[PDB]
A paper describes a structure:
Albicin is a potent inhibitor of the alternative pathway of complement from the saliva of the malaria transmitting mosquito, Anopheles albimanus. Here we describe the cryo-EM structure of albicin bound to C3bBb, the alternative C3 convertase, a proteolytic complex that is responsible for cleavage of C3 and amplification of the complement response. Albicin is shown to induce dimerization of C3bBb, in a manner similar to the bacterial inhibitor SCIN, to form an inactive complex unable to bind the substrate C3.
The dimeric C3b-albicin structure (class 4) was refined with C2-symmetry enforced, producing the highest resolution reconstruction of any of the 3D classes. The symmetrical dimer interface is formed by interaction of the MG4 and MG5 domains from each C3b monomer (referred to as monomers A and B) as is seen in structures of C3bBb containing SCIN. In our map, density accommodating two molecules of albicin per dimer is located at symmetry-related positions adjacent to the C345C domains of C3b. The interaction surface of each albicin molecule contacts both molecules of C3b in the dimer. After particle subtraction using a mask corresponding to the TED, CUB and C345C domains of the dimeric C3b-albicin complex, the remaining core structure containing the macroglobulin domains of C3b and albicin from the C3b-albicin dimer structure (class 4) was refined using localized refinement with C2 symmetry enforced giving a map with local resolution of 3.1–3.5 Å at the C3b-albicin interface. The inhibitor sits in a groove between MG6 and MG7 of C3b (monomer A) which also includes the N-terminal part of the α-chain (αNT). The side chains of Tyr 31, Gln 34 and Arg 38 from α2 contact C3b residues in the region of Asn 738-Arg 740 in the αNT segment of C3b. Although generally similar in its binding site to that of SCIN, the contact points of albicin with C3b differ from those of the bacterial inhibitor due to surface differences in the two types of inhibitors.
Residue numbers in the entry:
A (entry chain A): 1 to 43, 45 to 71, 73 to 642
B (entry chain G): 322 to 535
C (entry chain B): 776 to 930, 935 to 967
D (entry chain D): 1 to 116
Write the structure that this text describes.
Amino acid sequence: SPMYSIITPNILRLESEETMVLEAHDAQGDVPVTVTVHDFPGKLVLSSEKTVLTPATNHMGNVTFTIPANEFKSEKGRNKFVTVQATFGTQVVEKVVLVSLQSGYLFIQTDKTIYTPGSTVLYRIFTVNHKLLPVGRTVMVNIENPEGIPVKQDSLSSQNQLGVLPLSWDIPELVNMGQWKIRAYYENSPQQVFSTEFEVKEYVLPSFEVIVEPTEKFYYIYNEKGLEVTITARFLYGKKVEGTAFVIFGIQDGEQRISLPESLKRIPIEDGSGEVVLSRKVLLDGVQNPRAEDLVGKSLYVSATVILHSGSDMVQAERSGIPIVTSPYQIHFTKTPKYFKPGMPFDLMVFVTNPDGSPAYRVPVAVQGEDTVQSLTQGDGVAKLSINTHPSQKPLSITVRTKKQELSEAEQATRTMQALPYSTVGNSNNYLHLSVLRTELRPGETLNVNFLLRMDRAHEAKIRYYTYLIMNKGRLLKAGRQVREPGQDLVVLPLSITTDFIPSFRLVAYYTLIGASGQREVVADSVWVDVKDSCVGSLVVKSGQSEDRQPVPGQQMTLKIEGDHGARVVLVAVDKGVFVLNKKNKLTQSKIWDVVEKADIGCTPGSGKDYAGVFSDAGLTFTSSSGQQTAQRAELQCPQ
Amino acid sequence: SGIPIVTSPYQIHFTKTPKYFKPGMPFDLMVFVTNPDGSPAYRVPVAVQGEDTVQSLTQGDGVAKLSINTHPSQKPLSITVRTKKQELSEAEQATRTMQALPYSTVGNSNNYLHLSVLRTELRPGETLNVNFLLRMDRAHEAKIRYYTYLIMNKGRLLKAGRQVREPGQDLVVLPLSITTDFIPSFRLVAYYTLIGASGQREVVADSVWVDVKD
Amino acid sequence: SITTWEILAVSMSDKKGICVADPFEVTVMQDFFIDLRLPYSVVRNEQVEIRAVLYNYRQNQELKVRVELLHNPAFCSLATTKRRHQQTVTIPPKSSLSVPYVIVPLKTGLQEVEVKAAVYHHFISDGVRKSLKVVPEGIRMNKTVAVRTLDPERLVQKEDIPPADLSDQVPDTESETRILLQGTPVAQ
Amino acid sequence: ANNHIRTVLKLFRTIDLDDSKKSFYLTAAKYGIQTQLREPIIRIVGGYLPSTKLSEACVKNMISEVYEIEGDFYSKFSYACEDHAPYSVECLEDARDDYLTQLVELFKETKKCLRE
Ligand SMILES: *[C@@H]1O[C@H](CO)[C@@H](O)[C@H](O)[C@H]1NC(C)=O
Ligand SMILES: *[C@@H]1O[C@H](CO)[C@@H](O)[C@H](O)[C@H]1NC(C)=O
Ligand SMILES: *[C@@H]1O[C@H](CO)[C@@H](O)[C@H](O)[C@H]1NC(C)=O
């Protein structure tokens, strides 16, 4: 009784290439296959892209199609579904999948970050699709007042513009101040909107940047020395500043800011560096709660005002978010799988972070039990830990604690997790572990997964291959077999990681046997791998000259751009005084990758309650003619 | 001096590859692609002659981690490593062959041990996870409870320990703390011991060479 | 402008993807230069102070600047088409200096202010022309003319909005009137 | 030196551009010449021994070429530019780039006059 399976992304998209991997396990001879998609309910958006399966490919194929968007725009407030009904020879299998309206991203770039009234606004609107490629679509833009009333409306097409839409606006003279907003959204999907904020203010450009970085990015509550903050001031163009600097400290809880009257100090800066300390007596007396412990959680904030001895220019710089904490580390379980397998290593990805949020570097972690295990964090703040598991059904209570030296035991950071066992089909004890290296992988270097297996010797001849899939950015990227000769128990599959795998790929896998009374079963696994976040291509700007540095104003210089052939670059030069005055709402690769990762369908970093759970966690939909099919999804976001 | 006149821009070396393997279990090839003068080649796509769809890319230090599975057979295994860099004619690719004989058990009892391990430029301080992979039929699986391991560094037993293995599992991961005492290499040996056949004592061992950044 | 430009490049390639280069900074700087300091706006007929800040970045050379405020028909200051305003100052090395100027704006619009230097015994100069806004004395207030609800059947509907009084409007000042239309959705 | 400096400055006062032309154009042209052809020249000349002699002949050729180059820039700004309205600031900005480019080319070529 051969099976026929369809594996498709859990939520479909409009006007994009969506892949549906087709397998026919234990099938003899060629089988025609036709895939048709119909609207749900009712009945034919597309019925094209049929295929012929051959044993030359080991009976595996993929059918890619792009569903037209039309019936789709009539109703949007309630989720809409489509039915993917495919016929394998004379056997028909169908599955209802959700369809989203999101079709691409709009990254808005404004040249400056603060404008004065009577000055023109120059901004661009990049148009890219889910795969980060230029697309031709129609956009709408509305520029909002501080109160939120549109002031300008426009419609543009990205056709033949290579995904860049330069635009303009001349700010009216009589306008309200404060944050403005620019909201742009694709014309087909008006319920998803992207935005940026630019500030209209009365300003004249400053002359020098003031940096306040405390010695530690926190304040120990029991430290008797007080907060140690260093104020440094350098001119814009690279010279040291002489002046006098006022500073002040306060306690920032929730949204109310209270200042410390006994804290303002004048600390003259010589050679552009000054240091002031907030004695703990001041901190305790300023607040009305003498209990020092009850002050934890609240954040300090440093407001530094610098004036030159000329007295001609004044600049303000503020560093907030200095958390008052009793422990310098915060242990997170965001990346650790929440489900494990009996009798396998259970790789823990602990994420040791500083109290502010930045990743921690070179900190030893340990497990409270079996203290013989100890590790040390990598560059990105993830420490690989391995805990062997007894073959038992009881939930495993894993607690991890930081064991840094020269830190008192009443001062480390602790955390606890509950991990539940993978549940087989009818207690058959047929699992699959998929061991792998997880590090700051760079594109190009290979990876060796370990298709580890565990099953009784009575059924070691039925399994001869391992199917695997690779999610990335929301669509299947690669899908192939992995042959394994019977009698072999570990299989290493070399994976060629190109630059196309940025930033993460959710490798899955499965096999299929018949056992017990002769009922079909499926066993799956998942792995989340984090790749270093950089371009899929490469671009960098440097200077043509190799001599006679510090160009004088009015002098030609040549800047060299080393970009990929055929590409198009867009340039902008901003005075650094603007960033001194307001450094928020910039654009960089980090935010682009954050936005792309925030839209991934998968919603758990690997493993699951069982095979249906594993597939839904990955963001897939595995249905078969026999009946073993994944659970239905009808919500855009997985539960928090 | 030393500008060599050559007809091939790369030279494939098998200095670091183990010369013996285990039947039916992974065998890790460590090719050492080098420039004709002797410097380590960087970012060269090397591949095995058979199943040309498998290939890798050499890391910075000059070794490319290629893994090729093995059939459970006693016949000698032949490896034909063959670089396939682009912008080079097929007459320009450097080639090399090797023969690796199989591990021989005691009395053909089919007992093996394998220490699968990460192979990069380890830096002292970070941890390495070794996989004490075992192969044994369920006839005598209750007789093994631990794996003894030893560390050889600069001609001394750096750290000899144990690894308890609760019977019922066939893979256990032993975390190693790679301090600065491990410069530059350590030969992690391991073994167990059981009563097999008609009551004859026997021991099964393995070893791994790990290169740490110098 | 003597500052540090930050140049950002964003790629849009058809086949590969999208890139954003790390910002590249070129630090424009001169040996001896003026950095005139102006407020954003100075109210008409009210006296304000303008500072010219002269910099000298020779390691061990004392400098002898001769600053000067050219006459402008808009403002009012000591400069005149017959007599010129010159301070002959001395700048110690690696040191700043500040020169005070008092100017009374006289007419509205955007007006320019310039100072011209000329080093002695060497031949070096630098003058800066900066423009600052001048506005008539007053404050920004926005009185609501009227609010009304449109209902063609409960009130067609012929509606007229009388012009506002503008009793306190400052003369020769533009006034903007904004009209907003929003519907009233009903449900249930 | 100093006598050489006085001679060179006395020479860059003979230069004349038409007064009837627009004020911002005059400022643009004068600033271009003053920053690309009078600062490096004055810097180069300052580093001469007093006994060394200049060669004002092709310095007068410098002046002839700067008249011609300013004339070409003015012609390109007035009516040659077509993407924008005549006598408009964006035409000025578009033409100023290549004006300064040919001007620095002239200066680089004429750096050999300053000695015999
Ligand atoms: C199916 O996936 C393979 C992965 O190697 C790819 O080469 C092929 O183009 C895909 N099929 C289609 C129709 O795109
Ligand atoms: C034996 O080896 C261990 C390795 O950890 C070492 O700590 C110990 O000092 C050695 N000697 C004795 C007597 O334990
Ligand atoms: C007038 O302007 C203010 C800005 O301060 C803003 O609340 C709104 O636009 C108007 N408010 C009133 C009460 O007129």
